[PDB]
Amino acid sequence: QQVCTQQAETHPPLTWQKCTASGCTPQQGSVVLDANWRWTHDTKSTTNCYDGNTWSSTLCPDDATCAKNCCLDGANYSGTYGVTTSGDALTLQFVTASNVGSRLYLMANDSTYQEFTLSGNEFSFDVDVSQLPCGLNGALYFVSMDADGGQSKYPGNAAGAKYGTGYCDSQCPRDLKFINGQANVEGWEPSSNNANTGVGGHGSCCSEMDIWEANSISEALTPHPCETVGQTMCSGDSCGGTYSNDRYGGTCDPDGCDWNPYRLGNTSFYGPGSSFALDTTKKLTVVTQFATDGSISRYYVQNGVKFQQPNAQVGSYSGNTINTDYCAAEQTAFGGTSFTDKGGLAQINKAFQGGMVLVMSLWDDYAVNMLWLDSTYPTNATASTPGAKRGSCSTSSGVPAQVEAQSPNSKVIYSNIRFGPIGSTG
C-alpha cells in the first residue's frame, strides 16, 4: 500500500524501560495503529478503496494493482480509535463511535518496530483489566513481524511500519487487507456477521507468543509455533486457522500450549474480588521469563505481594512452568496434537531467539465469542470434559454485537513495561 496524508500520522509516545542487573532506564518509544484499522483510499482522491466490507472494483481489480492505486492514511488515535497514552501508560477503549477495538505495535522510531529477543530475558508489565467483562480480550503478545513491516522484501509496500503494515500471527489471518505489499481483494468474501470485515485469498503467518490473553475473568499464557519462524504468506485453505475449511492443515499452530490457571483447576486464583489471589478489580503486575531453552516461568505482583504461577498437576506433570513436559501432558489430558505437530517448544524457541514485535490490543471475538478464554469450550464439550471450562462466563456470553451494545466503554490499560535479562525487571 501507498501513503496519504489527508490526516497526519503521529504515533502516540510511550515510555518503557530497559533493565540490567544495575537497574532500569527509560526509553522513548511510541505506538502505531495496525494498517487494517485505517482508511484505505485512492492515492489521487478521497474515493474509498475499501468501504464497509467490500473493495473498490475500479481501484482494486487485483491484489498488485490495488496496492499501487491505494494508500493508507493517518489515524486520529483518540478521536477515532479511543487510543491514548500518558507517560508509560497506554489506554485502549473498546467502542469509539463506529470503531471497535484496536491493535498497536511498539515502535523504536517513526519507521521501525521495536524488536525484542525474548531468549534469556523477561518482560514485565502492569495491567488494569477491571473494565474487561466476559467476551473481551485485552491481549498483549509478541509476533515475529518484520521490523519494517515488510518494505525491504515487498516493493508494493510503500507504507511500512510507520502505518502498521506487516502483521502476522499463528492464526495465519486472512482478514488482513494488505499482505506482502499486495491487497487481499482477490478471493475476498465479506463476513456474514461483521459489516466491517471479510476474508481474502491470502493470509499472513508467523510465530506468536501470547504473553497475555485476558479479561477480568480469565487469563492465558500461550506459545504458538510455526513451521517457518518468520512472516510468510499463505493461500486460501492452505492457511489453516479459524477462517479456513481446515484449521490444522496450515503451517502454524492456531491452538498453542496454553497455561490458564482456571482451566488447570484453580478457579479462585484470578478473578473479580478480594477472595481471589489476584483481584482483577485492581491493577496487577505480570512478569514472564524466557529461559534459553524455551521454558517459560511466570509470577505476578499485586499490592506488593508476589504470587508465583500456581502449581498444576496434569497427568504425570506437576509444576508451574511451560515446557515440553507440560505441553505434552496437556495434549494428553485435554486433547489435541497441534502444538507438537507444528514443532512444539523447540520451534517456538527459535522465535524467542529472533526478534519479535510487541503487540497491544483490545478486541471481541466474531468467531466464537471468547468462550475459549473465559467459558466452556468447545460447544460439543460439557463442564465435566477435562479442560473444557476455562472461566466462569456463561456459554451464551461474548456475542460481539451484544457486548458492543452493553459494554462499549470497556477499556484496558497497559503500563510500566520493563524488559531485560531474567531477574532484572523487579
Ligand SMILES: *[C@@H]1O[C@H](CO)[C@@H](O)[C@H](O)[C@H]1NC(C)=O
Ligand atoms: C530506527 O530504530 C531502529 C531500531 O532500533 C534503528 O536500527 C535505526 O537506527 C533507527 N533509525 C533512525 C533513522 O533513527
Ligand SMILES: *[C@@H]1O[C@H](CO)[C@@H](O)[C@H](O)[C@H]1NC(C)=O
Ligand atoms: C489457588 O491458588 C492460590 C495461590 O497460589 C492458593 O492460595 C490456593 O490454595 C489455590 N487453590 C487450589 C485448589 O489449588
Ligand SMILES: *[C@@H]1O[C@H](CO)[C@@H](O)[C@H](O)[C@H]1NC(C)=O
Ligand atoms: C468437537 O467439535 C469440534 C469443533 O470445535 C470438531 O472439530 C470435533 O470433530 C468435535 N468432536 C466430536 C466428537 O464430534
